[PDB]
Amino acid sequence: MASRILLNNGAKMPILGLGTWKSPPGQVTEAVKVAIDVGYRHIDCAHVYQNENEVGVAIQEKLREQVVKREELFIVSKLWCTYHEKGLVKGACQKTLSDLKLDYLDLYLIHWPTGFKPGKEFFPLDESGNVVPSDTNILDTWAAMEELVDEGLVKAIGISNFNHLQVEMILNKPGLKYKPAVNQIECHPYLTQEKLIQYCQSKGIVVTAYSPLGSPDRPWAKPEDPSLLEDPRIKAIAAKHNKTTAQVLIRFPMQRNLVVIPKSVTPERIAENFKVFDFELSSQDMTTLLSYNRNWRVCAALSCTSHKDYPFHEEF
Ligand SMILES: NC(=O)c1ccc[n+]([C@@H]2O[C@H](COP(=O)([O-])OP(=O)(O)OC[C@H]3O[C@@H](n4cnc5c(N)ncnc54)[C@H](OP(=O)(O)O)[C@@H]3O)[C@@H](O)[C@H]2O)c1
C-alpha cells in the first residue's frame, strides 16, 4: 500500500487524512497536533466547519516545533455554497488561508455543486424549508477556481458531491484550464459508489471517501438509522484481523485506490485510526463489505432537493 496517490498536477496526496467536520474549536487544535505527531500529513478542512482558525493554530505549532515542514503537509479546504459567485471565490479562499495561517492550499474543492444565496448565513432557508439558491452555475464557479491555481493560492482544484453528469460538465467545458484533480464523495459499505468511482477513476480523477465510518456524530442521525461502526458483520471481519471496526472501515477504501478521511478529536482514536498500513483485507472481506451497499446516504442535503444542481437525483 503506497501511502500517497499521484494527482494530475504532479503532486502526491496522502491516502489517509484527518477529517475535521464537527471537530469543535475547543478540541480540534489538540486533534490536529496529535494527528501530525502520529503521521497524518493530510488534513481535510472547510470554511463551513467553523474551526479553520484552530486547525491553523495546530499546524503553526507543529511547523514551529520543527515536527513537519509545510511541503510535507497536504491541506485541503472547500469553497462554501454561499460563495459560488465568480467575484466571491477568491475572497472565500483567502479567508480560509488567513484562518489556516497558510499561504497556499494543496487542494481546494467546490464543496457542493449547489450555489446558495450569498450572505452571512451558511444555510439560508425559506418558509418551505428549502434552501435559497444563488444564480450561479458549475462552469463559471469552476473558472473562478481555476484562477486560484493560476495565482498560486492553491496547487490543485477539485469538486465534492458532484454526480457524473456534473463532472462531465466541467470536463467538457470549452476552454477548460485545469481538470478537477479530486471528487470527494460519501463512501462506505452502505454507499459503495461503484458507478461514480468507476467513472471518476476512468477520467483520471482521484476519489476521496468521506464519512467512511458512517458519520455517527452527524446532526440529523435518527435512532433507527444504520450504524456502520456497530454493524456485527463488520465487527466480525475486524476480529478476524485483530483490528478495530474503524480500522477495517478505513482500510476498505484504501484497497479501492481511494483516499479516505476519517474524523476524530479523540487522541487515542486518532492514533489507532492511522494504524492501517500493517494488515490487508482479503478478497472475501472486500467482496463482503461491497455487498453491504444499500445506497444509504448520511449526507443527502435534504433541504436542497429542489435546487437545480442538487446532485443526488441522478443514479450516479
Ligand atoms: N465533502 C463533504 O460534503 C463532506 C461531508 C461529510 C464529511 N466530509 C469530510 O469527511 C470527514 C469524515 O466524515 P465524518 O466526519 O462525516 O464521519 P466519520 O469520519 O465517518 O465518523 C466520525 C465519527 O466517528 C467517531 N470515531 C472516529 N474514530 C473512531 C473509532 N476508532 N472508534 C469509534 N468511533 C470513532 C468520531 O468520534 P470522535 O471524533 O468523538 O472520536 C466521530 O463521531 C469529515 O470530518 C469531513 O472532513 C466531507
Curated annotation (Swiss-Prot):
Substrate binds at H111. It comes from the Eukaryota. Highly expressed in embryonic epithelial cells (EUE) in response to osmotic stress. The record marks K78 as: Lowers pKa of active site Tyr. The modification N-acetylalanine is found at A2. The active site is at Y49. Its EC number is 1.1.1.21, 1.1.1.300, 1.1.1.372, 1.1.1.54. The modification N6-acetyllysine is found at K95, K222, K263. Disulfide bonds: none annotated. It is found in: Cytoplasm. NADP(+) binds at residues 10-19, 211-273. Changing H111N: Reduced glyceraldehyde oxidoreductase activity. Cys-299 may regulate the kinetic and inhibition properties of the enzyme, but does not participate in catalysis. Tolrestat inhibits retinal reduction. It is an enzyme of class 1 (oxidoreductase). Changing Y49F: Complete loss of glyceraldehyde oxidoreductase activity. One of its GO terms (cellular component) is cytosol. One of its GO terms (molecular function) is prostaglandin H2 endoperoxidase reductase activity. Monomer. PANTHER family: ALDO/KETO REDUCTASE (PTHR11732). Belongs to the aldo/keto reductase family. Catalyzes the NADPH-dependent reduction of a wide variety of carbonyl-containing compounds to their corresponding alcohols. Displays enzymatic activity towards endogenous metabolites such as aromatic and aliphatic aldehydes, ketones, monosacharides, bile acids and xenobiotics substrates. Key enzyme in the polyol pathway, catalyzes reduction of glucose to sorbitol during hyperglycemia. Reduces steroids and their derivatives and prostaglandins. Displays low enzymatic activity toward all-trans-retinal, 9-cis-retinal, and 13-cis-retinal. This is Aldo-keto reductase family 1 member B1.
